[PDB]
Amino acid sequence: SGPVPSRARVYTDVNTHRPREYWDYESHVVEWGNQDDYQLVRKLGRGKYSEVFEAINITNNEKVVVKILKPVKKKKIKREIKILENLRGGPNIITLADIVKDPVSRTPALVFEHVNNTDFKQLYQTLTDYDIRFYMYEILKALDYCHSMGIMHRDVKPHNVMIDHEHRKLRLIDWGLAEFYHPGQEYNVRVASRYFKGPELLVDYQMYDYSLDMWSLGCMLASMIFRKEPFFHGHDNYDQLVRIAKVLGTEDLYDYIDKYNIELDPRFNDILGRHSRKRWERFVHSENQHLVSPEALDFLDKLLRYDHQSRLTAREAMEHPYFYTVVKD
Numbered sequence: 001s002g003p004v005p006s007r008a009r010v011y012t013d014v015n016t017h018r019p020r021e022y023w024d025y026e027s028h029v030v031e032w033g034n035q036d037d038y039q040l041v042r043k044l045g046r047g048k049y050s051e052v053f054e055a056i057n058i059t060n061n062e063k064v065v066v067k068i069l070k071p072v073k074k075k076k077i078k079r080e081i082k083i084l085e086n087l088r089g090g091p092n093i094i095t096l097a098d099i100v101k102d103p104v105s106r107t108p109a110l111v112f113e114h115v116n117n118t119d120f121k122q123l124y125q126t127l128t129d130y131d132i133r134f135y136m137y138e139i140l141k142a143l144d145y146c147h148s149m150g151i152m153h154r155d156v157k158p159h160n161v162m163i164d165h166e167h168r169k170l171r172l173i174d175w176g177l178a179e180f181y182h183p184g185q186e187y188n189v190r191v192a193s194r195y196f197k198g199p200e201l202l203v204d205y206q207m208y209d210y211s212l213d214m215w216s217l218g219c220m221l222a223s224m225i226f227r228k229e230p231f232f233h234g235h236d237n238y239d240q241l242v243r244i245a246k247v248l249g250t251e252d253l254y255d256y257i258d259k260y261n262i263e264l265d266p267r268f269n270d271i272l273g274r275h276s277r278k279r280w281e282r283f284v285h286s287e288n289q290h291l292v293s294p295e296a297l298d299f300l301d302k303l304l305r306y307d308h309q310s311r312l313t314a315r316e317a318m319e320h321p322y323f324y325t326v327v328k329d
């Protein structure tokens with residue numbers, strides 16, 4: 001018989017009604033800028049798929065970021081480019097300023113606006129209750145926008161949320177794992193970072209959607225209000241589901257599995273055990289209590305659910321009482 005199909009409960013048909021050119025990234029013709037406009041200053045980091053540099057646009061003396069892509073998985077490149085251009089101008093979305101061909105790597109190099117970022121490790125130790133709510137709302141603006149545009153990020157994690165704390169500014173970055181949502185489409189479950197992988201990924205359910213980002217967001221929220229980084233600390237993808245099950249319980253996991261007619265990897269049989277759902281108060285202590293409120297716990301509870309269809313959508317999340325105290329623009 002196989003697994004039961006699933007559909008996003010919102011923005012389901014956005015791509016089906018757009019021109020083919022919008023989501024057919026393979027046919028996208030990249031318009032190239034002049035690589036000589038930019039001078040590399042220092043290397044900021046090297047990821048699995050790229051190297052990131054601080055640079056300067058010598059045509060306006062403005063600081064920029066240059067992301068030089070590695071010559072691996074070429075399809076991945078046009079996908080990120082198309083998604084960046086599609087989302088450009090949206091609230092709290094990183095702005096792609098240019099695309100040039102790097103003369104040395106002989107690969108595409110993405111030029112982004114410069115954002116004076118604070119290290120998340122140092123920053124999460126600092127955030128007040130108000131600031132957690134403020135920045136969560138800003139992240140939600142970004143996620144609702146890309147979801148409404150038919151795109152799931154699929155790599156929401158602290159590293160991909162760049163915050164300029166001095167100016168109260170936030171950008172969602174690295175859309176290299178982002179995809180267009182097409183209802184009924186089966187996707188690769190090898191996305192996101194381990195600690196932020198939704199249950200759908202960990203049980204190998206391929207027909208997922210925007211709600212994946214909302215699980216990841218929930219993981220971030222839990223790490224912020226409970227001051228535990230990361231909140232679900234698996235030592236591999238299998239232990240990762242066990243960690244989640246020790247909090248949300250095994251019965252709701254099996255119900256989830258049963259609902260979508262999924263068959264768990266049999267290796268879970270000797271390690272999953274039997275666990276009751278824990279009350280969120282379990283994780284409150286003297287050092288995080290000032291960050292926890294009934295509102296915060298209700299919100300978290302509605303994000304961290306096994307069933308991806310039952311999680312709050314981005315727009316619903318923005319309606320939650322948790323954000324009543326946040327001053328709106």
Ligand SMILES: O=C(O)c1ccc(/C=N/N=C2c3ccccc3-c3ccccc32)cc1
Binds near residue numbers: 044065162
């Ligand atoms: O992949 C992307 O979309 C992407 C977009 C923008 C940036 C910019 N990053 N900036 C900084 C950075 C990156 C890695 C490690 C350290 C830093 C840093 C330190 C101070 C000021 C800015 C940055 C990256 C990727």
